[PDB]
Structure formats: C-alpha cells, structure tokens
Amino acid sequence: MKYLPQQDPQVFAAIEQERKRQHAKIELIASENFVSRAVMEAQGSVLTNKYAEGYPGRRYYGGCEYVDIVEELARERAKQLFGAEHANVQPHSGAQANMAVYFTVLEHGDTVLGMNLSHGGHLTHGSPVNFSGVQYNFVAYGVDPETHVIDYDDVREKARLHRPKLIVAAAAAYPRIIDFAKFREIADEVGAYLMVDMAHIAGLVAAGLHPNPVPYAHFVTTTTHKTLRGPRGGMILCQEQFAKQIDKAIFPGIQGGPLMHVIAAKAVAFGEALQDDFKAYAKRVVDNAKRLASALQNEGFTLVSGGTDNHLLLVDLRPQQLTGKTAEKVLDEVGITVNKNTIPYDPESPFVTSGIRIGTAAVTTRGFGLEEMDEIAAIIGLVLKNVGSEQALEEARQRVAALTD
Amino acid sequence: MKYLPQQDPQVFAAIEQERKRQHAKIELIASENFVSRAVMEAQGSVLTNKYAEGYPGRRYYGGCEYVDIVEELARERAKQLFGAEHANVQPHSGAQANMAVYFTVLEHGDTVLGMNLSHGGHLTHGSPVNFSGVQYNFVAYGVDPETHVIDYDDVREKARLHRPKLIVAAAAAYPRIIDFAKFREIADEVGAYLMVDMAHIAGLVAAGLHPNPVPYAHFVTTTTHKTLRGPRGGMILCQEQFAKQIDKAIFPGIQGGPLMHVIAAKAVAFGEALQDDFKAYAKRVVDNAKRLASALQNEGFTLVSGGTDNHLLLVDLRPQQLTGKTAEKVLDEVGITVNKNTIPYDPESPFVTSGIRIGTAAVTTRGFGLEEMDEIAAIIGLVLKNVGSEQALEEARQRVAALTD
Numbered sequence: 072m073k074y075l076p077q078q079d080p081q082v083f084a085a086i087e088q089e090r091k092r093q094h095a096k097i098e099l100i101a102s103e104n105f106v107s108r109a110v111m112e113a114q115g116s117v118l119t120n121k122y123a124e125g126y127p128g129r130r131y132y133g134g135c136e137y138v139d140i141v142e143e144l145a146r147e148r149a150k151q152l153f154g155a156e157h158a159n160v161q162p163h164s165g166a167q168a169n170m171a172v173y174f175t176v177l178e179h180g181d182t183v184l185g186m187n188l189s190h191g192g193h194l195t196h197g198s199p200v201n202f203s204g205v206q207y208n209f210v211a212y213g214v215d216p217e218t219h220v221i222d223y224d225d226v227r228e229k230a231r232l233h234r235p236k237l238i239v240a241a242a243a244a245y246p247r248i249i250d251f252a253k254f255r256e257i258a259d260e261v262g263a264y265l266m267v268d269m270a271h272i273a274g275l276v277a278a279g280l281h282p283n284p285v286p287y288a289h290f291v292t293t294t295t296h297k298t299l300r301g302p303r304g305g306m307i308l309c310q311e312q313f314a315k316q317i318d319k320a321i322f323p324g325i326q327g328g329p330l331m332h333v334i335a336a337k338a339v340a341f342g343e344a345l346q347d348d349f350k351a352y353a354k355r356v357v358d359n360a361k362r363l364a365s366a367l368q369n370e371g372f373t374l375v376s377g378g379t380d381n382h383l384l385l386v387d388l389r390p391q392q393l394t395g396k397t398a399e400k401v402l403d404e405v406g407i408t409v410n411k412n413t414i415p416y417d418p419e420s421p422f423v424t425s426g427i428r429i430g431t432a433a434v435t436t437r438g439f440g441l442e443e444m445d446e447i448a449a450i451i452g453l454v455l456k457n458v459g460s461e462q463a464l465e466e467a468r469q470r471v472a473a474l475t476d
Numbered sequence: 477m478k479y480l481p482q483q484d485p486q487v488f489a490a491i492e493q494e495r496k497r498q499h500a501k502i503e504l505i506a507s508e509n510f511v512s513r514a515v516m517e518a519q520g521s522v523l524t525n526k527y528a529e530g531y532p533g534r535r536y537y538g539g540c541e542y543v544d545i546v547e548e549l550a551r552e553r554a555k556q557l558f559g560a561e562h563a564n565v566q567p568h569s570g571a572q573a574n575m576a577v578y579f580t581v582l583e584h585g586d587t588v589l590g591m592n593l594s595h596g597g598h599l600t601h602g603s604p605v606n607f608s609g610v611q612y613n614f615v616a617y618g619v620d621p622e623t624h625v626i627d628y629d630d631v632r633e634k635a636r637l638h639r640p641k642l643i644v645a646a647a648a649a650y651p652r653i654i655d656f657a658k659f660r661e662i663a664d665e666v667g668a669y670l671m672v673d674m675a676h677i678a679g680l681v682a683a684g685l686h687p688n689p690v691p692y693a694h695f696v697t698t699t700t701h702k703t704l705r706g707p708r709g710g711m712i713l714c715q716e717q718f719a720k721q722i723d724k725a726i727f728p729g730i731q732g733g734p735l736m737h738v739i740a741a742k743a744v745a746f747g748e749a750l751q752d753d754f755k756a757y758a759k760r761v762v763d764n765a766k767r768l769a770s771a772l773q774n775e776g777f778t779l780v781s782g783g784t785d786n787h788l789l790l791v792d793l794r795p796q797q798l799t800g801k802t803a804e805k806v807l808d809e810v811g812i813t814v815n816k817n818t819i820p821y822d823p824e825s826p827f828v829t830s831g832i833r834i835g836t837a838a839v840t841t842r843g844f845g846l847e848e849m850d851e852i853a854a855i856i857g858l859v860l861k862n863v864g865s866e867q868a869l870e871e872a873r874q875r876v877a878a879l880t881d
Contacts, residue, residue, distance in 0.1 A: 078514035
C-alpha cells in the first residue's frame with residue numbers, strides 16, 4: 072500500500088496486524104480462504120464510484136458501458152463454471168442471495184423445508200432470529216442419529232406432511248455429499264421448488280468433485296468467498312425461465328446499486344476457477360480433508376458421519392468430555408483457528424456445543440499437503456488431550472509456528 | 477495495479493476503460509462521487525478473507541482482534557461525525573440499512589408514511605416493486621405543487637389519517653433542506669417512530685451545512701458513498717436505547733458476514749470527513765450547486781423549487797418541450813452524465829419524465845468551482861436548445877473536453 076499508511080495510520084496499523092495474523096495462524100475456519108492479489112486489486116478499483124442499478128444493457132444510469140462488460144464477464148464465466156442458463160452476480164452476500172430467491176417464489180408465511188440448523192443447516196435456512204424464520208414458516212429435516220447422513224425418508228415425510236412451497240438443500244456444516252437428485256424427486260412429489268445453497272461446496276462443484284446441483288435445482292445460491300476462493304459476496308444461478316423474476320428480485324426487489332468493484336473481483340475469481348490449476352487445488356482440498364479426518368481418527372477423535380466427502384469435518388468431542396467452546400478457546404491459545412459447532416443431536420446449546428468444525432480450503436491455498444495434515448492432527452491431539460498442561464500448549468505453539476514458518 | 481493486468485487481461489482492460497471514462501466525462505449523477513486512493517486501498521486489503529459475524533468483542537469467530545479495531549474505529553468516528561449514541565457500520569448498502577430499520581420496528585403489513593416517490597422519495601421508501609412496498613403498507617406525503625417544498629400539513633394529515641407505525645423523512649431527489657423538527661413533532665403527535673434516510677445529504681450534515689437529523693430521529697440511515705465520499709455501503713445511527721435491537725436486526729436478522737474490508741474503507745472515509753478540508757469541500761459542493769442553479773436559470777431553465785439548498789438540483793424541462801429521457805440521451809452524446817428524474821406532479825411516466833437530476837459532489841471533488849459551474853450551465857443550454865444541430869453538439873463535446881482536460 073502507498074496512500075493508506077499516510078492518510079490513516081490507525082486503519083493501516085490494524086490492517087497490517089490482520090495481514091500478519093493471517094500468515095501466522097493455522098486457519099481452519101471451514102468457510103474461509105485466501106483470495107489472490109488480482110482479486111484484491113479488482114476490489115480496490117475505481118469501480119466503487121459507479122452507480123449501476125439495473126443490468127448490463129438495461130441500466131438506469133448512463134455511462135455503464137464498461138461496468139457492463141465486467142458484469143457480463145462475471146455472468147458468462149459463472150455459466151461456464153456451473154453450466155447454468157442464467158447467473159445473477161449482484162447479490163451483496165449469501166444472505167442476500169438467499170433472501171432474493173425467497174422473495175421470488177414465496178409469500179409471507181409460506182412453508183419452507185430446510186436442513187435442521189443443529190444438524191448442518193444455515194442461519195438463513197430458517198432460524199427464528201433470522202429473516203428466514205421470521206418471514207416464512209420453516210420446518211426441518213434431520214440426519215440419521217448414527218450415520219449423520221441426511222435422512223432422505225425424513226426429507227420426504229416432512230415434505231409430504233407440511234407441503235412446503237420450497238425445499239432448501241445444502242449446509243453450513245455437512246461433511247458428506249448431498250444427493251440433489253433425491254431432493255428434486257421429493258420436491259417433484261409434493262410440487263415444491265428446489266433451492267440448493269451450495270455456498271460451502273461451490274469450488275468443489277466447479278472442479279467436478281461434488282455433484283452439480285444446477286441440473287436438479289430450480290435455484291442455486293452460493294457465496295463467492297468459500298471454496299470458490301473469490302471476493303466476499305453472493306450469486307444466484309437458475310434456468311432461463313426464472314431469469315427475469317430472479318433479476319427483478321435482486322433489483323428493484325431487495326438491493327439498490329450493485330458493488331461493481333466486487334463484481335469485477337467475482338469475474339477474476341471465476342477466471343481463476345476456470346483454470347486447470349484450480350481443479351488441482353480443489354482436489355488437494357478434498358484429499359487434505361480426508362487425510363486430516365483419517366489422521367484425527369488416528370489420534371483417537373470421533374468424527375461426525377465417520378469422515379468427510381468434502382472440504383470440511385466435524386469432531387464430536389463427547390468421548391474426550393470436552394465442549395466445542397472449550398476446544399475452540401484452547402486451540403486459539405496455540406494459534407489454531409476453528410469454530411465450535413453443534414453436532415447432530417447435541418446435548419449442548421449452540422453457544423456451547425459438543426463439536427468443532429474444521430475445513431482445509433485456506434491451508435490448502437497456502438500450500439499445505441498431506442504431511443501438514445498429519446501434523447495439524449497431531450497438534451490438535453496434543454492440545455485437546457492436555458488442556459491443563461502449559462508445557463503441552465507451548466509445544467503446540469512451537470509446532471504451529473514451524474508449520475506457518 | 478500489478479497482478480490484475482497479468483491474471484485477467486479482460487477484466488483489467490474494462491477497469492481501465494472505466495477509469496479513463498471517469499476522468500473524461502462531466503459526472504453530474506447526484507449520488508456519485510470519487511473516493512480517495514486510501515479508501516480504495518482499504519477495500520483492496522486482505523480483510524476480505526475474514527469471517528466476522530457478530531460485533532467487536534462479541535463475535536462468533538476467533539481471530540477478530542484486529543478487524544474489531546477497524547470496526548470500532550468506523551463506529552467511533554461515525555459517532556464523532558454525527559453526534560450519534562450508536563453506530564452500526566455493517567449494512568452492505570442503503571437498501572440493507574433501510575431494510576434493517578424496518579425489520580427492527582415493523583411487522584409485516586404495518587403502515588409506513590414516506591415521501592412520494594415521484595416527488596423525491598426513494599425506491600426503498602415504499603415502491604410496490606421493492607421489498608418496502610411489498611412487505612409494508614406504504615402511504616405517501618407530497619410537496620406543494622408550486623413551491624415543490626414538502627407540505628408539512630400534508631405530512632401531518634397523512635400521519636393522522638393513516639396512523640403509520642413509522643414515518644420516513646429524506647429523499648433521493650429533493651433540492652431543499654428538510655425540517656426534521658417538524659417531522660418529529662408530527663411523529664410524536666401520532667405515536668410513530670421517525671426514521672431519517674440521510675443518504676444523499678450525509679456529507680453536508682457532517683460538515684454542518686444541513687441540519688442534523690440525529691437529535692430528532694429514532695433512526696438515521698445513510699449510504700457511505702454519496703456526499704459522504706466513502707466506499708459503497710450503508711450505515712445506521714441511533715440512540716443507545718435502540719442499539720441492541722438495531723445490531724440484532726443487521727445480524728442475525730438480515731445479513732451474515734460483514735464486509736470487513738469495506739468497513740475499513742468506511743473508517744478511512746469517516747477519518748477524511750473529520751478533517752477541516754472536508755468541511756471546506758462540502759461548502760464548495762453547496763456553493764457550486766447554487767451557482768450552477770443560478771447559471772442554469774440564467775440560461776432560461778426552470779428549476780424544481782426554484783433553486784437548491786444542497787448538492788442537487790432538478791431541471792423542469794417542460795418549458796423547453798423536452799422529456800428527461802431526451803435530455804439525458806443528448807447530454808450523454810456530448811460527455812455530460814445526468815439522470816432523467818420525475819418532477820413533482822410530472823405528466824410523464826418515471827421511465828420518460830419531464831426532468832433531469834444534477835449534483836455537484838463529484839465535479840467538486842475533482843476541483844471544479846464557480847467558473848466551471850457557469851461553463852457547465854452554458855454547455856447544457858447550448859445542447860438542450862440545439863438538440864438537432866450536430867455542429868452545436870460537437871462544440872459542446874469540445875467544451876466538455878476543455879473542462880476535463
């Protein structure tokens with residue numbers, strides 16, 4: 072940076088602390104990643120200055136010729152990545168992407184069927200303190216109490232009992248492949264739309280490592296910042312038949328001016344995702360998650376669902392008589408960043424929990440591989456088996472430092 | 477830029493076109509401005525990588541120590557700028573800022589009283605194709621048919637008849653000072669909350685050039701990108717008594733992860749606004765708008781309300797037998813960017829209109845002053861009085877080029 076250090080010493084000092092933090096810690100938050108310098112440059116561009124309500128070639132402001140090129144690059148690259156008929160790259164966030172789909176097809180108080188929030192569902196899939204659960208009547212399907220895999224007979228029974236207008240598939244914390252074909256079959260049986268929120272797995276879908284929901288869903292939502300490794304924001308994919316309605320839901324429905332600089336950054340990220348090296352990266356994410364899962368099991372940890380098919384895993388800490396809160400805190404002390412996370416049928420509140428959620432997207436981006444996964448698992452074992460030993464924690468600290476350099 | 481040109485030639489070429497465009501044109505879109513290089517650098521930072529749901533010291537992710545410093549800088553500087561008891565700097569946009577306030581105090585179908593959209597009100601103040609008009613029962617107050625000033629007796633009568641739960645004051649296209657004291661008096665009479673949407677005038681308020689709504693309103697919303705000259709985004713100000721409720725409305729209510737890099741950019745912009753030179757800038761914006769208004773009148777144009785008290789003006793093109801659409805198109809041909817805009821009691825649709833909206837915030841930022849205002853007015857006169865003369869339009873083109881260099 073050149074201008075920020077002089078203009079704002081306070082903001083610059085904090086940014087620099089954060090930059091150094093991102094390098095020093097082992098970042099295992101499943102929803103996080105590290106964007107490229109090109110992506111950041113796009114976000115840091117003069118495109119922030121441009122009002123561009125509307126869509127390419129159909130704006131409500133003059134002078135949009137060039138931001139139009141940018142938005143269309145984003146849309147076309149998204150379509151190439153996911154084989155979707157239509158893309159809307161304007162959503163400010165995952166929240167807004169989901170909000171727009173709900174706004175498109177639902178009226179206030181309509182019934183929606185989503186994944187149980189304490190089994191892996193997201194806040195925006197029906198929490199009673201979120202717009203989703205306040206505006207619409209959410210009911211939930213669960214995972215099997217033993218396998219922790221989605222119970223598709225429960226999906227079906229809930230759908231048939233409650234007659235939802237919309238079924239939501241996808242998750243904030245589900246370590247296995249989701250069967251989109253079965254979701255569409257059930258949706259078809261009850262005459263419900265299917266929305267798939269692929270936010271977590273979007274990069275894996277792009278790389279052909281998770282089945283693509285696009286052929287099965289009426290609407291696919293996603294964030295651009297998780298496994299897709301793009302800027303912070305949202306996106307909606309759908310078939311041409313819903314294009315007009317979806318676009319109108321975003322504007323003038325729920326948003327105003329789009330963030331054109333962020334949309335530029337989305338285009339850049341989609342460009343990166345179209346490259347061969349991204350597919351290799353995504354495979355390493357999945358390989359690393361499996362290896363980390365296996366290595367954690369070797370250390371004596373129980374994993375929700377017994378492993379992983381994707382970028383993320385959940386440790387069930389009950390055998391160690393630890394809460395997720397306790398584990399999260401102590402791992403923070405040694406420089407490993409995880410989330411506490413409810414496990415299916417958790418006896419604890421969502422504020423305490425019996426689990427931790429871990430993902431490999433970020434560490435993979437920094438070049439970590441199988442050997443590093445083994446070491447991460449060994450450090451976690453050292454820490455969680457010796458929470459009362461300051462000597463053990465200092466050893467862990469030193470081993471974390473050795474990994475990050 | 478260093479990395480974007482190599483990584484993405486297509487995105488870079490379009491960004492560069494846009495950058496050159498912003499320099500070449502006379503940008504009179506009233507809601508636009510040019511942010512500093514420091515603001516852009518903040519947006520282009522690694523803060524995009526950080527999940528930080530929650531608030532400073534009360535997050536749902538570890539490792540937020542530094543993004544917390546950034547968010548608190550934004551909040552504290554906002555409070556200093558506006559004398560508010562509480563700030564929420566997380567809203568992704570003006571849309572989301574307004575959405576959150578509505579979510580806080582209203583239930584589905586509650587009555588809200590806002591400014592007539594064709595008299596200056598914003599889309600989010602009750603359009604039937606916007607969430608505001610779909611989710612809530614909006615009624616409207618108008619301006620006087622002759623003076624084009626808000627009719628406060630109409631505000632009062634509508635309030636007393638319809639018994640709104642909430643009254644919204646502020647505008648996308650109102651060229652005069654708004655009397656917030658009278659709005660609060662009326663709100664008090666009918667037991668309604670008062671929300672002021674100061675998006676357009678926020679920079680003028682910060683500089684003491686428009687009365688501050690903070691002392692009078694329960695909630696103040698704003699965008700950060702108009703006269704405040706900051707990054708694209710929103711903000712909510714309120715008294716401490718509503719702080720918890722407002723914060724909960726933003727998260728977990730209507731948003732997820734905040735855009736921490738944009739929040740950094742907000743802090744930077746607020747830092748800039750706290751400087752003496754910003755107050756001088758804001759006075760020039762207002763001085764320039766008055767001078768441009770006067771100069772347009774000298775050219776024979778009629779202005780809505782007969783002039784301006786702020787950064788923006790509206791030309792009533794009926795005396796020239798022109799529509800706003802026609803004027804917008806022809807001005808585009810010579811390199812002047814304006815919006816078509818409805819005038820109060822417009823005989824034309826919002827898609828055609830009888831007016832153009834002009835603002836001086838952007839040209840003032842680039843260093844334009846009174847002499848430039850005279851020339852802009854003269855060029856507009858030349859163009860709009862000779863729409864059929866290609867020679868006149870080429871002269872205008874050359875004069876526009878002379879202004880921008």
